From a paper:
We therefore crystallized ClpB NBD2 from T. thermophilus under nucleotide-free conditions as well as in the presence of ADP and the nonhydrolysable ATP analogue AMPPCP. Crystallization experiments using 2-propanol as the precipitant yielded well diffracting diamond-shaped crystals for all three states. Structures were determined by molecular replacement to resolutions of 2.8 Å (nucleotide-free), 2.4 Å (ADP) and 1.9 Å (AMPPCP). Most importantly, our structures of the nucleotide-free and AMPPCP-bound states are of significantly higher resolution than those available previously, allowing a more detailed structural analysis. The nucleotide-free structure contained a phosphate ion bound at the same position as the α-­phosphate in the nucleotide-bound structures. This single phosphate ion forms a salt bridge (d = 3.0 Å) with the positively charged side chain of the sensor 2 residue Arg806, which is not observed in the nucleotide-bound states, in which Arg806 is involved in a crystal contact with Glu520 of a neighbouring molecule. Apart from this, the structures of the different nucleotide states are highly similar. Strikingly, in all ClpB NBD2 structures determined to date the side chain of the Walker A lysine Lys601, which is crucial for nucleotide binding and hydrolysis, is present in a completely stretched conformation that prevents the expected interaction with the β/γ-phosphates of the bound nucleotide. Importantly, this inactive picture characterized by a stretched Walker A lysine conformation and the absence of Mg2+ from the catalytic site is not only observed in our structures but also in all other ClpB NBD2 structures published to date, independent of the nucleotide state.
The molecular chaperone ClpB, the bacterial homologue of Hsp104, is a disaggregation machine that provides thermotolerance by resolubilizing and reactivating aggregated proteins in concert with the DnaK (Hsp70) chaperone system. ClpB belongs to the family of AAA+ proteins (ATPases associated with various cellular activities) that comprises a wide range of molecular machines which utilize the energy from ATP hydrolysis to remodel their respective substrates. The AAA+ disaggregation machines Hsp104 and ClpB possess two NBDs per monomer, thus forming double-ring structures with 12 potential ATPase sites in the active hexameric complex. We determined high-resolution X-ray structures in different nucleotide states for one of the motor subunits, namely NBD2, of ClpB and combined the structural analysis with nucleotide-binding kinetics studies.
Residue numbers in the entry: 518 to 545, 547 to 637, 650 to 849
The structure:
Amino acid sequence: HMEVTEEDIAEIVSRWTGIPVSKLLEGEEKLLRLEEELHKRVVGQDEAIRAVADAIRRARAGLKDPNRPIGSFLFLGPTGVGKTELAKTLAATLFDTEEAMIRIDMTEYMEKHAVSRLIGQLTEAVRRRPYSVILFDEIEKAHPDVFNILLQILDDGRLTDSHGRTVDFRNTVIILTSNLGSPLILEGLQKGWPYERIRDEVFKVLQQHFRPEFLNRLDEIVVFRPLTKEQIRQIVEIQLSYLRARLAEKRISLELTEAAKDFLAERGYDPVFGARPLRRVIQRELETPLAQKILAGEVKEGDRVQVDVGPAGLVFAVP
């Protein structure tokens, strides 16, 4: 039908039921091309994306335990290389909006009485949103008791609160994240440890916090890799999207050189936080002098701006 769209109908069903549009429109095939959706935003990390996609494909084919969340993942490796981005993108694609991602920072869940806070910070959030990606950040800091409740989610896709009434988790996607090993790998490189030492050290620290009985309940254990220079160069480009869209209103083009992107990349990426400090770097190195250039009148309506590297920082040109 022409005047009435698929979206029009889907929205009605979506609003009456509470089922996301995406979920109603999953079949109209996208599951086949879900890796490319996630690639629009998550540069690199091809293994992590396939994992997540393969897990979701299995649940959608009716091949997994129905009494479980759709997917359960442990995302290991360094921070700032795509974990949160992926989690968000995952929510936006499967459940329409990033607002459909619940983030539990386990730093607040270390001192025993933290279970009650969950059961109901967690249980209430998943009560009003049955269709949600749940992001447990740095899960290794979490207290044992708080870890026990997480297993209950992994066992039957449900969880009891204070009243006794169970909250359904069978439509949720659980992503757990941790750095464990990475800071340690950084230690041994700065301390000149032999490879096998570092490798032995990481393994035992992982064994301490995550015991087989818990990992067995997970769909995939993903280890995120550090980014290559080329991957970072694409991360720079993506991060510019908003600025470039802001300038585009006044028909202003922002055209960086090869050296320019590397410059930002160098200072906006480090092995500790990955690419997380890049935003502030862009804002300081490029967005600052550009603002000055505009307000000085040296950059105008429709102007094409060429960004190059220099000795002082970034140099700007008008052709």
